[PDB]
Amino acid sequence: EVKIEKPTPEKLKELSVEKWPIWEKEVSEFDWYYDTNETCYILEGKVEVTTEDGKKYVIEKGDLVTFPKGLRCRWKVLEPVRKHYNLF
């Protein structure tokens, strides 16, 4: 379960995501393994994620996304991505 929501302004505010590090990626496709839990706020872009077990999600600008520890998936970056991210 990749969890995805359009966060309220308050939730976003209280997480102080603008202090989180920034990661960017050009159009590309690659496997990823989540060593830790990870929450990402998408500033720009569009990505199709397919998990090891075949589940499919799209994440795009304005989404708050949480990836669980131990998830193996493949990212397909369709529009260049910019995000704030917090490992936990």
UniProtKB/TrEMBL annotation:
Any one Pfam family match given in the protein's UniProt record, by short name: Cupin_3
Transmembrane region(s): none
Domain of life assignment: Bacteria
InterPro entries: RmlC-like_jellyroll, RmlC_Cupin_sf, UGlyAH_Cupin_dom
CDD domains hit by this protein: cupin_TM1112-like
Gene3D superfamilies noted in UniProt: Jelly Rolls
UniProt cross-references to SUPFAM superfamilies, sorted A to Z: RmlC-like cupins (SSF51182)
Domain (S)-ureidoglycine aminohydrolase cupin: from-to ranges: 13-85
Coiled-coil stretches noted in the UniProt entry, renumbered to this chain: none
Name of the protein described by the UniProt record: (S)-ureidoglycine aminohydrolase cupin domain-containing protein
